[PDB]
Homo-oligomer: A and B are copies of this chain.
Amino acid sequence: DQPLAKDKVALLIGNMNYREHPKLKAPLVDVYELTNLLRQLDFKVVSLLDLTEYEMRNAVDEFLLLLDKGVYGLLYYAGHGYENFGNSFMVPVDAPNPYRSENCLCVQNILKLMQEKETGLNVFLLDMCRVTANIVFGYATCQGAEAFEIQGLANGIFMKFLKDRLLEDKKITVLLDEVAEDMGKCHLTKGKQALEIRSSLSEKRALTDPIQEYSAESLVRNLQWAKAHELPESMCLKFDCGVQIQLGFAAEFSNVMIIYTSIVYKPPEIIMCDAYVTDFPLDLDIDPKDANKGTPEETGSYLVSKDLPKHCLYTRLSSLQKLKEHLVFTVCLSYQYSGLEDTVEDKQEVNVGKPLIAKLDMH
């Protein structure tokens, strides 16, 4: 008979900007594409980029609390990893050089924590660069870039093959076995990408299984998702000179938001009219040289450009998990009247609350 999911939840972590290790590029595109594919399969997804050790530990611990009886969970990690004494570790962006196991997340410890859950299906996919829980563990490993090799937005090897099979209505073990076979058919993969599948799945479970809504347990999961996806409402700021500026917000990842400013009305007597954002909380570590760009791409934002209106100034806030209080910042306006030489200045402070992952209370 048809297997069903009580619910479907997923946590995706992509680490790229390492303080003491080579920077990676594939986790950005891989996490974004996997988020959209899992959304088509009706997963409630939280996707985080560039997490420190404590951030990673807190995110995994909170994901594990959602794993009630019958729930389908998926944890995906892309970034640096390593093996030591038969144990594999996920490397956070603040890890020292050389790698110390105390500063990394032990994959085996997470599998043991998952083993204690009564989940319908638990999928743990590691895309690293070097009474049953129904756990399926996909361990993909690739070599680090060659220092003297020639290096757009390309997918990593594993995600390239996984995205072609992930939407299939087949048992997840069968599906991953097909992925391993596709990679074995390619000669370019033969020495640069490996895949090991560990499974204790005893039932025909698939990511496409339907979901079985007003219970407290169900509401807790919906509420965590809803908070993590909450963007500030758009604001129309009215200045004394008559100029009106709209402040817009778009989501790229659960901890990455794009802010844009647009001139909605400029009185005829005003010619120059620059609106820009400033005074961001110090926790976010925003470099002002990268804020107020003429295009979203100049802020390092390539994936949500479709959902952004043109003729704005864009700013990328990419460390929202470090925001411990409300997001308070300033919108400055620098303008010049027709027939006059001096530039006039004005500003207003805005409070847009706790956006996206920050709504879950960061500590």
Question: Which residues of A are at the interface with B, using a C-beta cutoff of 8 A?
Answer: 86-87, 108, 132, 171, 173-174, 177, 180-181, 183-184, 194-204
Contact = CB atoms under 8 A, between A and B. Distances in A.
Contacts of A171: 177
Dominant SS among interface residues on chain A: mixed
B199 A197 contact: yes
Contact of A177 (B132, B174, B194, B198): B174
B196 A198 contact: yes
Contacts of A195: 200, 202
Nearest to A198: B198
Nearest to A201: B180
Contact of A180 (B86, B183, B199): B199
Contact of A203 (B173, B184, B198, B204): B184
B200 A180 contact: yes
Contacts of A194: 132, 200
A199 B181 contact: no
Contacts of A200: 180, 194-197
Nearest to A197: B199
Given A86-B86, A197-B198, A200-B196, A173 B177 contact: yes
A184 B202 contact: yes
Contact of A202 (B86, B183, B199, B204): B183
Contacts of A87: 86
28 contacts: A86-B86, A86-B87, A86-B108, A132-B184, A132-B194, A171-B177, A173-B177, A173-B197, A174-B174, A174-B177, A177-B199, A177-B201, A180-B199, A180-B200, A180-B202, A181-B202, A181-B203, A184-B202, A184-B203, A195-B200, A195-B202, A196-B198, A196-B199, A196-B200, A197-B197, A197-B200, A198-B198, A198-B199
A216 to B, nearest CB: 29
A54 to B, nearest CB: 24
B181 A204 contact: yes
Contacts of A184: 132, 202-203
A198 B135 CA distance: 12
A202 B185 CA distance: 8
A194 B184 CA distance: 29
- Of A108, A173, A174, A202, chain B has the most CB atoms within 10 Å of the CB of A202
Contacts of A132: 184, 194
Contacts of A203: 181, 184
A177 B198 CA distance: 11
Contacts of A196: 198-200
Given A132-B194, A177-B177, 8 more contacts: A132-B184, A180-B199, A180-B201, A196-B198, A196-B199, A197-B199, A197-B200, A198-B198
